[PDB]
Every structure is written in C-alpha cells, then in structure tokens.
Amino acid sequence: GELSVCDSISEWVTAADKKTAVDMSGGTVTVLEKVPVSKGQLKQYFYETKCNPMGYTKEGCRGIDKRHWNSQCRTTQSYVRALTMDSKKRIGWRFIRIDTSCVCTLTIK
C-alpha cells in the first residue's frame, strides 16, 4: 500500500532462532521457548522488520534530493519485552532489543 523511502522485510522469528539477546542494561540474556500463562503456555515469537537485502534502496533511500545529500537505509532496533533468563539463572520479564524498522539517514556530499 504505502511507499516508504526505504525497503524493508518483516518476519516472525522463533525463540529458537533468537536464543540469546541483549537487554536494556547492556547484558546478555537467554530467551525462553515458552511463556506460562494461566490455562497453559504460549510460544515466544518476535516480529522483526529489517532493511531488505533483496530490495531497491541499497544505494540510497528513494526520493532523496541527490543535489544536496547522500542517504542510507539502516536497520534500527527497539525494545520489546520478553520472558528471559540472565547469567545468574534468574527468570524474568526484561526488555531486549530486536530489529523493528529500516530507516533513512541523510549525510553530506
């Protein structure tokens, strides 16, 4: 539908494919396979979006004014909460960083 200055792809990543991740404080944590909820258990999945490596904005972002700027599409991260387990075996909900967007950035020349 919408046309962005940068091309991106998104996918449901399984905990197995993202077993360790960095948390807010800068530490490494282990992401669990399942989250306990009353009535059962849910599987942990993450929805990540990154710059498209098979796309059209590898050279620069779309529509930028080439007369005054250079551009670059870069994947950016954001914090998402997940049931993790730190280096001391403590199970808890922490905010880990995962890929959430592919944004444009201007540079001179």
Binding site: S10, I64, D65, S101
Partner: protein, 115 residues
Amino acid sequence: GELAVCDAVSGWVTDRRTAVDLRGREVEVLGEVPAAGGSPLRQYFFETRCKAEGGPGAGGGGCRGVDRRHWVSECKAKQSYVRALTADAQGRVGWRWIRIDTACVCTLLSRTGRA
C-alpha cells in the same frame, strides 16, 4: 555527521488503553497481567513515534531531504506486533498480537521526476 529524515521520539507508553490487532479489529489493553504469586505484572510498552490542526493553507510538511520538486512526502509511524493481554469487543480476555509504534518513517505520496 548524519541526520534523520523524520524526527522521532522514543519512550515509555503507560497510557495505551487500546490497540489494533492482527485481524484489524480494536481491542482494549489491560494495565496489569495477573502473574502467579504475589504482585501483578505491569503491562506497558516502549514505542517510537513522530515528533510531528495546523494553520489552514500552510501545511506542506514533508521529510527532510526529499526532492520537493518531484515528491509530496509525509512522516508516518510504523508498527510492529507485540503480544499483550487484552479484551476484545465481546469481552473475551486473552493474549493477542497488537500493533504498537516502533518507528517514524518517510512516506512518498505522489508524483516523480518533474512531472
């Protein structure tokens, strides 16, 4: 020495009372998750929005750096799904995928090469 095309703001959102789900419907977002034991777990998010009802006529607010001669642009927010305990239109409580804002991106609305 680089610069954003769209100025965003990041922070904790403690006021998200509703959200759109996977199916496009609107659900209510609970403030607390009853965690097993003593104190309930607090439900809040971390989101990134645009720093962008303004004088009439005026407007014309595009993305920084897009060729205004070829394009009509606009910074819009982008979503990602997170799982959250929510209540649907009929009252059923449960865990659903909801859209929260995780970026402010530039959108090209119309035109091209000095049409």
